[PDB]
Amino acid sequence: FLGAAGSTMGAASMTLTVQARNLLSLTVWGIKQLQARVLAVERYLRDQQLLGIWGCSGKLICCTNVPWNSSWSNRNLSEIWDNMTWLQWDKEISNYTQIIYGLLEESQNQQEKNEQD
Amino acid sequence: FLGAAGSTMGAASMTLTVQARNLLSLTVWGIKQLQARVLAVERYLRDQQLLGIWGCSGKLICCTNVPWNSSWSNRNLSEIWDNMTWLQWDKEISNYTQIIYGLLEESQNQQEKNEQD
Amino acid sequence: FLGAAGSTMGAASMTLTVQARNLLSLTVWGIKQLQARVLAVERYLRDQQLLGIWGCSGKLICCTNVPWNSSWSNRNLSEIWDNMTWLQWDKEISNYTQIIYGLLEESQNQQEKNEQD
Amino acid sequence: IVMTQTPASVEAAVGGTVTIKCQASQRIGSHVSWYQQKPGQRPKLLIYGASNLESGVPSRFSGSGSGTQFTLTISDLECADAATYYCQATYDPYTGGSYGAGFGGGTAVVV
Amino acid sequence: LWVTVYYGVPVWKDAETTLFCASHNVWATHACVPTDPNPQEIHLENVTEEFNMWKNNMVEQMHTDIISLWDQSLKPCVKLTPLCVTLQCTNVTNNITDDMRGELKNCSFNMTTELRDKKQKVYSLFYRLDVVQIKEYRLINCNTSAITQACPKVSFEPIPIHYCAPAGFAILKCKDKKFNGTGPCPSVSTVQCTHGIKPVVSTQLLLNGSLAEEEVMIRSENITNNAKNILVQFNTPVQINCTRPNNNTRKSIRIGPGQAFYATGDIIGDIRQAHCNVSKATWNETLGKVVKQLRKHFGNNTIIRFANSSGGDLEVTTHSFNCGGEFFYCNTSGLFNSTWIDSITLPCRIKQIINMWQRIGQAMYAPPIQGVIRCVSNITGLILTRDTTETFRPGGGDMRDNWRSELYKYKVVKIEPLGVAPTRCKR
Amino acid sequence: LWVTVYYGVPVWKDAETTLFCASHNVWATHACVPTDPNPQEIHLENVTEEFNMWKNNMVEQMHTDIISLWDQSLKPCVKLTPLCVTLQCTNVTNNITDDMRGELKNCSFNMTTELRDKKQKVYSLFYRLDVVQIKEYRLINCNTSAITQACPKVSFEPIPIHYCAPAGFAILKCKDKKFNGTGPCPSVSTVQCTHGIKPVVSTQLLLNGSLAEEEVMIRSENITNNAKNILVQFNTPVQINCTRPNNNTRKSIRIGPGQAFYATGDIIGDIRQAHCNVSKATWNETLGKVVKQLRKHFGNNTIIRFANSSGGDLEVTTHSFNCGGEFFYCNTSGLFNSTWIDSITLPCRIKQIINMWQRIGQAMYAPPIQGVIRCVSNITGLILTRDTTETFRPGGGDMRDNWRSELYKYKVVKIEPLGVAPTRCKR
Ligand SMILES: *[C@@H]1O[C@H](CO)[C@@H](O[C@@H]2O[C@H](CO)[C@@H](O[C@@H]3O[C@H](CO)[C@@H](O)[C@H](O)[C@@H]3O)[C@H](O)[C@H]2NC(C)=O)[C@H](O)[C@H]1NC(C)=O
Ligand SMILES: *[C@@H]1O[C@H](CO)[C@@H](O[C@@H]2O[C@H](CO)[C@@H](O[C@@H]3O[C@H](CO)[C@@H](O)[C@H](O)[C@@H]3O)[C@H](O)[C@H]2NC(C)=O)[C@H](O)[C@H]1NC(C)=O
Ligand SMILES: *[C@@H]1O[C@H](CO)[C@@H](O[C@@H]2O[C@H](CO)[C@@H](O)[C@H](O)[C@H]2NC(C)=O)[C@H](O)[C@H]1NC(C)=O
Ligand SMILES: *[C@@H]1O[C@H](CO)[C@@H](O[C@@H]2O[C@H](CO)[C@@H](O)[C@H](O)[C@H]2NC(C)=O)[C@H](O)[C@H]1NC(C)=O
Ligand SMILES: *[C@@H]1O[C@H](CO)[C@@H](O[C@@H]2O[C@H](CO)[C@@H](O)[C@H](O)[C@H]2NC(C)=O)[C@H](O)[C@H]1NC(C)=O
Ligand SMILES: *[C@@H]1O[C@H](CO)[C@@H](O[C@@H]2O[C@H](CO)[C@@H](O)[C@H](O)[C@H]2NC(C)=O)[C@H](O)[C@H]1NC(C)=O
Ligand SMILES: *[C@@H]1O[C@H](CO)[C@@H](O[C@@H]2O[C@H](CO)[C@@H](O)[C@H](O)[C@H]2NC(C)=O)[C@H](O)[C@H]1NC(C)=O
Ligand SMILES: *[C@@H]1O[C@H](CO)[C@@H](O[C@@H]2O[C@H](CO)[C@@H](O)[C@H](O)[C@H]2NC(C)=O)[C@H](O)[C@H]1NC(C)=O
Ligand SMILES: *[C@@H]1O[C@H](CO)[C@@H](O[C@@H]2O[C@H](CO)[C@@H](O)[C@H](O)[C@H]2NC(C)=O)[C@H](O)[C@H]1NC(C)=O
Ligand SMILES: *[C@@H]1O[C@H](CO)[C@@H](O[C@@H]2O[C@H](CO)[C@@H](O)[C@H](O)[C@H]2NC(C)=O)[C@H](O)[C@H]1NC(C)=O
Ligand SMILES: *[C@@H]1O[C@H](CO)[C@@H](O[C@@H]2O[C@H](CO)[C@@H](O)[C@H](O)[C@H]2NC(C)=O)[C@H](O)[C@H]1NC(C)=O
Ligand SMILES: *[C@@H]1O[C@H](CO)[C@@H](O)[C@H](O)[C@H]1NC(C)=O
Ligand SMILES: *[C@@H]1O[C@H](CO)[C@@H](O)[C@H](O)[C@H]1NC(C)=O
Ligand SMILES: *[C@@H]1O[C@H](CO)[C@@H](O)[C@H](O)[C@H]1NC(C)=O
Ligand SMILES: *[C@@H]1O[C@H](CO)[C@@H](O)[C@H](O)[C@H]1NC(C)=O
Ligand SMILES: *[C@@H]1O[C@H](CO)[C@@H](O)[C@H](O)[C@H]1NC(C)=O
Ligand SMILES: *[C@@H]1O[C@H](CO)[C@@H](O)[C@H](O)[C@H]1NC(C)=O
Ligand SMILES: *[C@@H]1O[C@H](CO)[C@@H](O)[C@H](O)[C@H]1NC(C)=O
Ligand SMILES: *[C@@H]1O[C@H](CO)[C@@H](O)[C@H](O)[C@H]1NC(C)=O
Ligand SMILES: *[C@@H]1O[C@H](CO)[C@@H](O)[C@H](O)[C@H]1NC(C)=O
Ligand SMILES: *[C@@H]1O[C@H](CO)[C@@H](O)[C@H](O)[C@H]1NC(C)=O
Ligand SMILES: *[C@@H]1O[C@H](CO)[C@@H](O)[C@H](O)[C@H]1NC(C)=O
Ligand SMILES: *[C@@H]1O[C@H](CO)[C@@H](O)[C@H](O)[C@H]1NC(C)=O
Ligand SMILES: *[C@@H]1O[C@H](CO)[C@@H](O)[C@H](O)[C@H]1NC(C)=O
Ligand SMILES: *[C@@H]1O[C@H](CO)[C@@H](O)[C@H](O)[C@H]1NC(C)=O
Ligand SMILES: *[C@@H]1O[C@H](CO)[C@@H](O)[C@H](O)[C@H]1NC(C)=O
Ligand SMILES: *[C@@H]1O[C@H](CO)[C@@H](O)[C@H](O)[C@H]1NC(C)=O
Ligand SMILES: *[C@@H]1O[C@H](CO)[C@@H](O)[C@H](O)[C@H]1NC(C)=O
Ligand SMILES: *[C@@H]1O[C@H](CO)[C@@H](O)[C@H](O)[C@H]1NC(C)=O
């Protein structure tokens, strides 16, 4: 059901409905199933909470109020969307994940709410 | 808390806030409670995931971009909303559920997103 | 990570992204962890279900169609937002919680849906 | 189920150089062999993988490539060394086998 | 005005949940969540909150879990049922001091070998406190409960654990010097996990706990009601040095297929009495501080008398000390012998058959430890009871009163993030 | 440009999770999730991924679960403690061949009856490998561990199981012929569940596993380091036919209320030695292929010598074969007897007292099976160790090195569906 099969980010961005569904889909082999079901739920909810707080809930593609900081990359969109595998991209900017996520939260709480009320 | 008590689809569509809430609401009778709580959560989340992917999240009534295919029914809306019990309706078109759901996902991913970005 | 640290409701309403995240964040000390994880999930989902049914999903601040009934309070907004700690406020109107919540559900099901379809 | 070849036909003077090129529809590492087929004869192997010649093959034949882009350079062309050259994928990325699995070509090299 | 819904509001209410353990040893378990190497503590400005150490359910959870672990860890061990046999037994006299006369006995008996059709004659040296005279003796508790030996590889060291709230919950800590057992305090902070608490098990004198920072604290329910225990927390440690001077050996005796009994062996060197040394001047200053604080509730010119103990069993009248896995029952008299208007040597006894949290129906046998034991501990507080002059003496009781002295600072609350307020806006 | 968030991105990272079982027998459990009758396999074009069979935690889970099941399934069975009695015992000579002289003994003993005040005199024929001479004998392990008989209704057949990842996780399979134990491979597919793996337990020769598809595969860590095992996977099966020719009977002897011991009975017909027949020509071609492949790492003109075994216990020096529930320890010599520059009959022994995964502290007794056993298996690979000439010989070790030969193709990964990229759009 996975992509990144030579699929560059442009094409890969269109297969999101598949990968988004396979996230949820007292014997030795008894208790283990209960523990495994709980784990699957936990991961699902953590991602949904982030989409919620950033205002991306219900969407596969979410444009936000955070500008791209050039310190995060050394390529043009015309280079990455056409030549890079989603998987390669994620590895290249992995060390900025926590920066972007914090900015995304502020971009909602303040910009779309405290300033809108 | 259940409807379909002689309630045709028109009237039944208005009671959705009740039925939508009763979905979530190491001894022999110890471990069983833990297993039962996990099951209740699992069912709740599966329905929420479908509403999310179809763009029906947060709504009780959701109009979509999928046209009704006449091959799915032999009745007018003027006949089913007034004369059929929600329960009867669900049984009559049960064999098309998987068709409609696949169409609903495409109607979002492509029509409301890949074509909007 | 908690507020209400002398923070009146005005200021407190701006820290919601923090408190909203710490809600999700067969040995004696084995089975207990499994039970505790299930509890944390259960509480998270109950609050999300209420936000969903009231049309407040995805938001930290949600204005609704329910008017404030003066029988619920003895103060002006100019008095409570500036002089009361969120915590004090919640205690003062705690006995009306169930009234407000029922009104909020009707304010969606009927006013935003049955009357919009 | 992998290779395509594009030059179709090339002419050169005696002592000159020509090149030909193949592409893979799927990445196949360095798993491309090359053949020389003279008219009326069964084909001869020139190259094992993208960078390796078979013993007995003149040093004037050489090549390289990886992933999906592969080439063959034939220098010091000898008079009347005319042949059709071909590419073969020696790796099947779908089944995992490593054997000739798809073949194609056509170069009309004339000297 | 209109109703506006807010989510993530900083509101909490009192709650009871189970707690997570964070951190081979009998209690350590080695199945706890690794702790946060850089834990956070969040101060709450202008927050006053009410705590009650006597009604704190964290105490009950510590008690329940430690008992359950005791059994989960020691249950899969060798049973000693075959030792409930008439013993032939006489006094050890070969190389002893006067203080040890009658303390040890050399017992011998007919016991099952690897084969069930054969018997072996074996011997073990037992402490007087473990046998009952019927030269014929019975082991203590062969008429009351089954005896299981503890597994020799299991450590009894009081390795600390931390309790952590589940997401959706938090633990509030009362950071307030001079705060007694109950009431509001103006200094509160939020933590997710507690400080590490060592599951130290003792009676009369609390060992290796936390210290008070400004003054000796006297915490009790009521005070004037003399049916309650007084927990006294020192603001300075008193160092106590305990020893078991005899060099012991041990024997492994097969009691049937797959099992062996750890018997005591012979003693190397002369036989001396176990004892604890409490620094004397330190102890005298420490009690003077306790007295000055006690007078605040009894009168500035009231005589405060300290007595040794009430009558009772060893678990009541002697200090209970568990170190190295050995079980000591110390005299604790001479420490409490004054009216208030070098070292103190406390003779101490050793017992191997233990009845502890489950007072009846179950017994555990502490196997011998070879060599000599030296143990140094911090006295951090006292358990006192009260009787012109007030009389106080060492008390005791269930472990809950000792463990609550490390949890008096914590309360469990739940977070209620969803609520409403009137605003000038509308949908 | 602006940050755009994408959800459901096809991104994965290495992960360790527990796996689900999908599929009365001792391992089958009959509490697994029914498998998908039409499972999917999804090919990943242009994906190269790195696998390492020696660091694969799926091996550790198989090992841990199979051991836990062994005990969960055999724990609630009759204990044989009463048989640890001096036995009076002499050789079986009534109708035997030369190869069996001294192999079986007729033992008799005094054992507990339904009533505890009465004894019965019973007998059983034991294999030499199960007793210790003290005409007086002890059973093996009555001086080491408790012996519990396996329940007679429990099957030991190696019924295959499938491992399945939890939602949010996936298993990647390396579909690459000629792929060795480590490194990247260009052919990867995604599955949710593994192929079925039979929990076959053996030593020296791997039975009933998967075959290589193009060439005999030689997989090892290092190769040049002779401290590591070499796993050799055949691309063709070698058929091996094992038998236990004696027609046995069995007896049920009550050992007290609610319990009975399964004793061996009398033997019908003459007594012959158990043995295995390996087709000879097939075996000779199979090793020739192994040798041609071994030379790739040792030299084209290097002599490859095969020796029978190192010294050691039966679990090391003989082939371990479990079939019908009977436990065989086969000679495995003559199969490895060459330098490389009809059938082979392997004499085989039978043992009933088993010490397997838990090497000490526990023993299991295999009850007798009535009648005659004939078993046909596929040799799918070898466990070899290495010592001008290289010398190789059958090896052994913990079961993890045998089970990893069926899991070398799999890796567990986690899905990380949420991430960002710069785009020409904005909110
Ligand atoms: C109060 O805290 C002190 C300090 O942690 C505890 O003392 C420690 O006790 C353990 C157990 O007896 C000692 O460990 C042993 O050390 C010997 C080597 O000398 C080793 O052979 C044993 O196998 C074992 O590891 C530890 O050294 C000792 N620490 C110090 C600094 O002396 C004391 O037990 C605690 N009090 C109570 C009542 O629990
Ligand atoms: C390798 O695979 C083969 C084929 O599955 C295994 O052989 C099978 O072994 C079982 C157990 O001994 C046989 O079942 C028995 O059959 C008799 C009737 O003949 C019945 O009375 C017993 O109650 C039991 O059901 C099974 O027939 C046999 N299969 C074949 C085709 O002969 C072999 O055991 C595996 N090797 C190893 C080491 O596990
Ligand atoms: C059960 O079915 C009956 C009809 O078969 C429903 O009765 C009618 O309800 C309508 C309102 O929807 C009224 O205007 C009619 O006058 C009723 N008929 C009679 C004879 O009284 C009845 O409402 C159904 N039950 C429920 C709960 O909907
Ligand atoms: C605790 O309460 C005090 C007042 O009782 C708050 O102090 C004032 O805060 C405002 C800002 O909101 C300042 O303009 C005033 O000058 C402060 N007063 C003084 C005397 O300095 C205090 O901020 C509250 N604590 C918190 C965290 O909000
Ligand atoms: C694997 O990579 C190759 C290129 O290295 C991709 O092949 C090209 O795909 C484009 C469409 O995106 C076609 O227009 C080209 O003609 C293809 N090249 C050749 C030589 O055929 C291939 O599509 C990638 N695999 C996947 C699944 O995307
Ligand atoms: C007895 O109390 C002393 C004093 O509090 C403890 O020694 C301190 O330990 C902390 C670490 O927990 C160090 O940071 C201090 O520097 C130490 N102070 C001194 C004077 O040494 C001692 O560890 C306690 N002993 C026991 C068994 O708990
Ligand atoms: C308990 O033992 C400690 C040592 O572990 C004793 O303190 C030491 O005393 C010597 C002098 O005899 C000094 O040289 C050391 O520097 C001291 N060590 C420490 C850490 O202070 C202590 O006196 C003993 N207590 C009792 C009551 O006997
Ligand atoms: C508390 O101290 C008193 C006074 O010493 C103890 O009473 C007697 O003490 C003498 C030694 O001076 C003993 O020989 C007597 O046997 C003690 N009397 C009794 C009845 O035992 C008193 O026992 C001490 N109490 C405790 C619990 O130790
Ligand atoms: C021994 O190996 C043979 C050959 O691989 C196995 O027989 C094949 O079994 C598959 C089903 O798994 C069939 O589709 C093939 O047609 C069979 N081939 C032949 C030649 O019979 C045989 O089952 C294996 N034996 C054991 C015990 O595993
Ligand atoms: C192992 O047993 C098989 C049968 O289960 C033997 O193969 C059979 O041999 C006879 C001739 O004696 C043929 O008629 C059958 O058709 C063969 N059957 C099969 C399935 O091949 C095999 O030879 C025995 N192996 C050894 C080493 O003795
Ligand atoms: C490996 O083979 C050698 C050679 O046969 C074995 O050595 C001796 O073999 C003879 C039979 O030819 C026996 O009678 C001797 O008892 C064997 N010697 C010893 C010391 O046992 C050798 O034992 C074989 N090794 C293994 C593990 O089977
Ligand atoms: C105990 O008795 C045995 C004889 O049964 C003797 O050898 C041993 O020395 C005695 N031990 C002591 C401490 O008296
Ligand atoms: C053993 O101790 C008792 C109690 O003190 C004493 O009466 C008896 O005489 C002692 N026996 C020996 C041999 O010393
Ligand atoms: C062992 O049993 C014999 C039976 O004759 C008895 O005389 C002897 O005193 C017993 N010995 C012990 C140490 O109990
Ligand atoms: C065991 O014997 C002692 C003898 O002092 C007695 O006090 C105790 O009550 C007895 N135990 C039981 C359970 O009867
Ligand atoms: C603790 O302090 C409060 C006042 O803050 C006081 O009312 C209460 O009685 C004190 N507790 C005890 C046991 O004296
Ligand atoms: C206690 O003090 C005495 C001297 O009065 C000394 O001989 C003994 O060893 C000390 N014991 C301990 C445990 O320090
Ligand atoms: C403590 O020691 C004294 C001797 O000073 C003794 O009289 C008293 O009985 C002992 N107390 C206990 C509880 O052992
Ligand atoms: C208490 O003090 C007196 C002296 O006033 C002394 O004789 C007695 O032995 C002391 N008691 C203890 C237990 O040390
Ligand atoms: C202990 O305090 C008493 C007064 O209560 C005093 O008489 C005595 O001298 C003091 N002893 C020491 C060692 O300080
Ligand atoms: C074993 O001994 C019994 C007598 O106790 C005899 O009847 C039986 O035939 C013997 N069995 C064998 C195999 O020698
Ligand atoms: C039993 O076997 C041993 C070992 O081979 C042999 O010495 C003995 O003589 C045999 N006994 C009989 C009765 O054959
Ligand atoms: C059974 O016990 C008697 C006791 O007199 C003994 O003579 C006999 O040898 C024992 N028999 C067996 C088979 O152990
Ligand atoms: C049991 O006896 C055998 C005799 O050969 C010995 O090697 C083994 O070590 C003994 N078992 C134990 C646990 O001592
Ligand atoms: C497996 O193949 C890689 C190259 O793809 C090589 O580097 C590695 O050494 C090989 N493994 C062994 C054990 O030789
Ligand atoms: C092995 O081969 C022999 C003939 O050499 C035959 O008698 C025997 O039955 C065969 N055994 C098996 C298990 O096939
Ligand atoms: C295998 O059989 C040979 C006889 O050919 C024998 O010498 C050797 O000791 C046996 N090996 C084992 C491990 O039983
Ligand atoms: C190994 O081969 C030799 C002949 O070279 C033969 O005599 C010997 O018995 C064989 N070894 C085995 C175990 O079959
Ligand atoms: C087995 O291979 C050897 C060479 O290593 C050869 O001499 C022998 O004849 C072969 N035997 C069979 C049955 O093929």
E203: tokens are: 């009676």
- The pair phi, psi for residue C47, each rounded to 5°, is -70, -35
Reduce the DSSP state of residue F291 to 3 states and report it.
Answer: helix
Query: What is the rounded distance in angstroms from the CA atom of residue F97 to the CA atom of residue E80?
Result: 49
Judge residue F281's burial from the number of C-beta atoms within 10 Å of its C-beta, 0-12 exposed, 13-18 middle, 19 or more buried: exposed
Residue D6: which residues within 8 A CB-CB, separation 6 or more? Answer: D21, D22, D23
Total count of residues recorded for chain C: 117
Query: What is the rounded distance in angstroms from the CA atom of residue E14 to the CA atom of residue E169?
Result: 10
**Dihedral over alpha carbons F165, F166, F169, F172 (to 10 degrees):** 10
What is the arrangement of strands in the sheet containing D3-5, beginning at the earlier edge strand? D3-5, D18-24, D69-74, D61-66
Reduce the DSSP state of residue F146 to 3 states and report it.
Answer: strand
Q: Regarding beta strands D109-110 and D10-11, do their DSSP bridges make them parallel or antiparallel, or are they unpaired? A: parallel
B82: tokens are: 């007034």
| DSSP H or E segment with residue E59 | helix E57-74
Closest CB to F72 among A28, A40, A90: A28
**Dihedral over alpha carbons F405, F411, F412, F417 (to 10 degrees):** -170
| DSSP H or E segment with residue E412 | strand E410-415
Nearest alpha carbon to residue C35 among B35, F401, F44: B35
| DSSP H or E segment with residue A28 | helix A28-53
Q: How far is C59 from chain A (nearest CA, A)?
A: 8
Contact at 8 Å (CB) between A28 and F68? yes
Q: E254 and chain F: CB distance < 8 Å anywhere?
A: yes
Closest CB to C29 among E12, E32, E414: E32
* Chain-chain contact of A14 with B45 (C-beta, under 8 angstroms): no
Contact at 8 Å (CB) between B49 and B29? no
CA angle A55, A59, A65 (to 5 degrees): 40
Dihedral sign of CA atoms F278, F284, F285, F290 in order: positive
The number of angstroms, rounded, from the C-alpha of F137 to the middle of its chain's C-alpha atoms is: 31
Residue D18: which residues within 8 A CB-CB, separation 6 or more? Answer: D10, D12, D73, D74, D77, D109
Q: Is E337 in the pocket of ligand 19 (CB under 6 A)?
A: yes
Contact at 8 Å (CB) between A42 and A25? no
Residue F350: which residues within 8 A CB-CB, separation 6 or more? Answer: F127, F129, F244, F274, F326, F327, F328, F329
For ligand 15, atom 2: residue with the closest CA: E143
What is the arrangement of strands in the sheet containing C61-67, beginning at the earlier edge strand? C61-67, E2-7, E418-423
Query: What is the rounded distance in angstroms from the CA atom of residue E296 to the CA atom of residue E289?
Result: 12
E129: tokens are: 């406190």
Closest CB to A24 among B35, B45, B113: B45
Reduce the DSSP state of residue B47 to 3 states and report it.
Answer: helix
Structural domains in chain A (count): 1
- The pair phi, psi for residue F348, each rounded to 5°, is -140, 140
Query: What is the rounded distance in angstroms from the CA atom of residue E400 to the CA atom of residue E397?
Result: 8
Contact at 8 Å (CB) between E221 and E339? no
Q: Is F155 in the pocket of ligand 28 (CB under 6 A)?
A: no
| DSSP H or E segment with residue E401 | helix E400-403
Cα E304 to middle of ligand 19, angstroms: 16
Amino acid in the structure at residue F69? L
Query: What is the rounded distance in angstroms from the CA atom of residue E361 to the CA atom of residue B3?
Result: 57
Q: Residue E378: nearest ligand to its CA?
A: 6
Contact at 8 Å (CB) between F381 and F234? yes
Total count of residues recorded for chain A: 117
Which residues does residue E362 pair with via DSSP β-bridges, in sequence order?
E146
Nearest alpha carbon to residue A41 among F33, C45, F194: C45
Query: What is the rounded distance in angstroms from the CA atom of residue F156 to the CA atom of residue F322?
Result: 8
CB atoms under 10 Å from CB of E250, counted, come to: 17
Query: What is the rounded distance in angstroms from the CA atom of residue C60 to the CA atom of residue C47?
Result: 12
Query: What is the rounded distance in angstroms from the CA atom of residue A114 to the CA atom of residue A109?
Result: 6
Method used for this model? cryo-EM
CB atoms under 10 Å from CB of E148, counted, come to: 19
Domain that holds residue B76: 2-117
Query: What is the rounded distance in angstroms from the CA atom of residue E296 to the CA atom of residue E230?
Result: 14
Q: Regarding beta strands F146-149 and F362-365, do their DSSP bridges make them parallel or antiparallel, or are they unpaired? A: parallel
CB atoms under 10 Å from CB of C45, counted, come to: 20
Nearest alpha carbon to residue F8 among E189, A47, E248, D52: A47
* Chain-chain contact of E257 with F138 (C-beta, under 8 angstroms): no
Residue E133: which residues within 8 A CB-CB, separation 6 or more? Answer: none
Cα F338 to middle of ligand 28, angstroms: 9
Contact at 8 Å (CB) between F164 and F193? yes
Q: How far is E118 from chain F (nearest CA, A)?
A: 8
End-to-end Cα distance, chain E: 12
Contact at 8 Å (CB) between D32 and D21? no
E316: tokens are: 């009541």
Which residues does residue E197 pair with via DSSP β-bridges, in sequence order?
E161
CA angle A22, A28, A31 (to 5 degrees): 55
Query: What is the rounded distance in angstroms from the CA atom of residue F263 to the CA atom of residue B116?
Result: 79
Query: What is the rounded distance in angstroms from the CA atom of residue E380 to the CA atom of residue F192?
Result: 57
Burial F100-139 (b: 16+ CB within 10 A, else e): beebbbbbebebbeeeeeeeeebbbbbbeebbeeeeebbb
- What is the DSSP-derived secondary structure letter of residue B84? -
Nearest alpha carbon to residue E328 among E361, E266, E374: E374
Judge residue F75's burial from the number of C-beta atoms within 10 Å of its C-beta, 0-12 exposed, 13-18 middle, 19 or more buried: exposed
